[PDB]
Amino acid sequence: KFQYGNYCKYYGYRNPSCEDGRLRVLKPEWFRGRDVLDLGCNVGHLTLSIACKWGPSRMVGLDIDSRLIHSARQNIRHYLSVFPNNVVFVTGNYVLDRDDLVEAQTPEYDVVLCLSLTKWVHLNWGDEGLKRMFRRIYRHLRPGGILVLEPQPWSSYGKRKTLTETIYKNYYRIQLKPEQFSSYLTSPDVGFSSYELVATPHNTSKGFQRPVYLFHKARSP
């Protein structure tokens, strides 16, 4: 059971080809020379694809599962500050325990990637945990920064609801649905000033054809 979406063979079935269709949708100019945080990086195949070809000055992959982070560090050699010096991995839970911790975050990134993560944060920590993540992302971005959001649809949550009693409990308490993420992220509770639907990448499975959004943090104060 992978109650956080912490699958240890994830890319083997997401990208059987080994070609991640999201790389045709993400734009190189978003990353080149920028500080990037990759949330829920798993074993880091996508993290390392970006770090080794699109030259971010700093790329940080974060995952709650230390086993996947160790794997990600061992995957660096498959992609051989220029890469590999521009990438680091960290084990951690991005969802913060208190709203006081979430509003003390200082800006450090030009880009935050939040790809295929919202469902797992939502199921494990409820609306409250998802909103803490959203507010923390905004606080962690510099003016002019961007959030790249790839959220799972609500229709795909239900088949995971029995993983744990807490997940089950959260499933039936959730009131902020994916269809309302955009409005929430651009409300004063978070503060993103505009957003765009970039595209829906192609994938062998329709279940992985998810919209990719760009949320902009305004350059002016």
Add this chain to the structure above:
RNA sequence: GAUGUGAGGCUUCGGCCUCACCGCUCCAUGUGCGA
């Protein structure tokens, strides 16, 4: 990625309801690891 069967009833023929049955799991999946 994958929810089957039957009787009765209501259908706005799109299905739905009650009950009975069958299940409550199977399949896909490693660029990590080598006691």
